[PDB]
Design a protein around this ligand. Structure first.
Ligand code: LYS
Ligand code: LYS
Ligand code: LYS
Ligand code: LYS
Ligand code: K
Ligand code: K
Ligand code: K
Ligand code: K
Ligand code: K
Ligand code: K
Lengths: 292, 292, 292, 292
């Protein structure tokens, strides 16, 4: 499933920074019960940067095992070296994942032609559906609509997670791609606006703690009931902002712990523990959303 | 050597994308002959993002072997996960390298407290001198002067490669650190200005192809001879700019090949070959510098 | 009328830079015939900066006289000194204009409290409806949604021309104001997106040369027929971009001359004549729109 | 005087918002006593946007009268319409002022060719020396070095007030102009850095309240005594920053009142009175500088 409310799931960790199977199970059951459309495993929110390849694969496989066919799983498979992205993708071929979420190379700042060759090569060597991921504030590069249009001609490049927050991208991309190419927001605070403009859903941090409200918001949006959706969005807006009051996923993991969905809020360095002021801001946002 | 003209040396490749030992040897001998102060091996210009750690370590160790004590070698040791940076640094402990160039974590956008903990942990696991490296355009993170002050208190944190191009940082940092903390430019086009303000040298892309000129410019700067240094700077200004006409190190590798310093200008995806328009721009800059 | 396609009309000039009544008459008749909703007289596009107060008033009065009740006229009344804005507003009280378009103070960078006091004072001393105008790229300040919400409580502050191009502003402002407060785009290239998000129309440069297509696009948008509207928008998109290929209103005045709507394309310094390359780009855009 | 510590003097007002002659006289005598090099009358800090031309001219002429040949007076003469800038400059022809400070047109965003024609036309209508003034954060326009080169060829264009805070501009401009073209900082917090790179002085907000310290710092800089100049700079750094805690000249007028240099801290809308939090910040900065 590549539409509606898709959660960019936290990778819950014990105090040692190793994946907590019991916490992950509780999250997955929560998403199944709450109507989340799909789970993005080891995306940005899942701390892909600080897992090594083996651990990253372990988490995807554990998520599939625990999901047990009840909810679709999309794996984070991005890398900043094209060989590495291919390699990681091969580990998931015939795993049971429904598709891959693949970020533009970060740090090295390739040209648009470099991005085209990068994604073309990755798509060539899998039959899995690929969702491109643009997040310039993290990567230092910006995958432009023209290049997205070029890549959407590749059979198994099927959509894009657009995380610029620049809403003009929706229709710039839509006019260059076929009607079946999926446009997903990667920016919770602008996601409803993104859907109103023609987007198909959101790959969401907020959904980690407000899964039912997110699922109902995205359904209302898909039906054209934007005023109704916007009531939900306004109750969620403090979370859409304050889940980034300190670096994601610091706030959302604390929030998941506060709700009892995970055993510990531990992250891996260079992510550090939430500050006291951050706890108080996040808690206020959870209360605004009616979750505590 | 942590002052003067420090080359961020290319990792020259064969057509297959693997390190070319003959080319690396030619470069290194060139830098010895030219008066380059030190070599940074597998920095940004050396394609650290697209080598695996073993490959990265092999290039560093080959560069150290070829230098044969003639010129000091600083290893690139940055990573966006602290555990991984520690692992890479530990490869070089007792190796012969003189210190480490360690970039702020990229993509994951840690807080300043996160940056402090990351670099502190790395410095704790080595006796080697650490040069911090700030380049927000690539990493999505900005290591601010206050945090650089805090880190300069750690015994073996000894300098910073400041690649913002924001020259106010020179004196902001200088006033927070001891007189022996080294300030190096990471931005060729502003590097003479950076030294004029108090900086100690440059870690340079341009030095790959104008090593003698860069070394002479930096020596004149260190002596307070700014007007003479500026004449050299003006002759190199088109390279300082046009070596970034396409993404670094695409132009500089081509320039190295054009000068006969390396056998091929091959890079790894997502870096792609220089365009025809790029070749003509870079050739014009080399001709301006009197190198061709 | 404060909805649909509203033209930010050029101030046509003879070769001496004085207002050309005959050219203005032809424009006004064109707008009446083509279904434009209203005319903004001496806005940005009408070169408010380079008319003195007497000339500025002359042009508004001439536009009202020529309109002869057939189309509503909104006067540009902005200034960067609150006394000056009041003064200019008084000149229009009981003139026949339907409202005023009042820009945030430029150059002096007031606080949000300063903007609130500025606009509150101007509104106090007129019974004319006021449309706030935010264009940070010109002014150096940004009138934020919170302050817009404060000002919308003032009885005769009735809407806002939002020219940031940042589409998140639509619903940030809408949630803070009453249902009858008018949201108008000031950014042609994002205007259709702006209306799709809940905006009520556009104060347009493009409408100067494509008045009928703009009027039909904004009606389709108001009816919810966005796919239909978007076909029109895509034929207009090169004009929405290339009317800013050189500083507005340089391109649009040339385009008006090329279509025969005005006798000369003359502007006042510091605006200068269109370049040859600009003529060719603008002409291509007019052809794309089917106007030549 | 177009070098050293040049004060962008406040236009002190009474409670009604009109120029206070006794306060202006106290300031001017202060600057004579302190060793200020020159006074810029009705620059940005002097509230040029909210005086009418007659008022503006009266303040300039009063400042010239009060200076009584003791200290040179440069008039602010900028406008965003060329005709208006010419008119204002012509007011001061044969007046006693030593030159003119003329800002790039604001709001209307002319091209570089437009800037060239604007300043050329103004210089043609006077024998007075012209200092260009670039401050893109306020004007929406950036007068680039290439254009500054082109204008420096006009006989009576003799310098530039560079208020970008982008220190690379010093040497970019210096290499395109003659050795006698003057480079002055418009940015107090980077001004010592600017002089260290080659600049000749500063047109300063801080000098309104730390005139002796600023004059001593600039003299030390001119002599090449940078380390001693930096000690003074560090003592003034909180003022350099906190005089912009609210919009200039709100903080500096309050500071002048607090020091007894002016009778009231009144400004004209849209500038508004300093907040209580602002007063406490500025008082802390004055105490740091040892002025209180
Ligand atoms: N820390 C490295 C490797 C991560 C590998 C597994 N996801 C990066 O962000 O590219
Ligand atoms: N491509 C990954 C791993 C590089 C590992 C060796 N230098 C990154 O940029 O972090
Ligand atoms: N040129 C000045 C005065 C214009 C007055 C009439 N609109 C400005 O842009 O504020
Ligand atoms: N407030 C108008 C006119 C100022 C005229 C005298 N200084 C402007 O900023 O251009
Ligand atoms: K395939
Ligand atoms: K496809
Ligand atoms: K140290
Ligand atoms: K009123
Ligand atoms: K109202
Ligand atoms: K000159």
């Amino acid at each position: 499933m590549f539409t509606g409310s898709i959660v960019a799931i936290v990778t819950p960790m014990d105090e040692k920074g190793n994946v907590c199977r019991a916490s992950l199970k509780k999250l997955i059951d929560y998403h199944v019960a709450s109507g989340t459309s799909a789970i993005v495993s080891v995306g940005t929110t899942g701390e892909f940067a600080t897992l090594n390849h083996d651990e990253h694969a372990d988490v995807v496989m554990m998520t599939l095992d625990l999901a047990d066919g009840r909810i679709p799983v999309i794996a984070g498979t991005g890398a900043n070296a094209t060989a590495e992205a291919i390699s990681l993708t091969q580990r998931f071929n015939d795993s049971g994942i429904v598709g891959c979420l693949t970020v533009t190379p970060y740090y090295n700042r390739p040209s648009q032609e470099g991005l085209y060759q990068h994604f073309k090569a990755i798509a060539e060597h899998t039959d899995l559906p690929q969702i491109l991921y643009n997040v310039p504030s993290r990567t230092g590069c910006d995958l432009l609509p023209e290049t997205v249009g070029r890549l959407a001609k590749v059979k198994n490049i099927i959509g894009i997670k657009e995380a610029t927050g620049n809403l003009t991208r929706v229709n710039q991309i839509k006019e260059l791609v076929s009607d079946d190419f999926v446009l997903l927001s990667g920016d919770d605070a602008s996601a409803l606006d993104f859907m109103q403009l023609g987007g198909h859903g959101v790959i969401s941090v907020t959904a980690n703690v407000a899964a039912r409200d997110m699922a109902q918001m995205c359904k209302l949006a898909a039906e054209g009931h934007f005023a109704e959706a916007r009531v939900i969005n306004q109750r969620l807006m403090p979370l859409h902002n304050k889940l980034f009051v300190e670096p994601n996923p610091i706030p959302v993991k604390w929030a998941c712990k506060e709700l009892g969905l995970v055993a510990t809020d531990t992250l891996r360095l260079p992510m550090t523990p939430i500050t006291d002021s951050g706890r108080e801001t996040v808690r206020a946002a959870l209360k605004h959303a009616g979750l505590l």
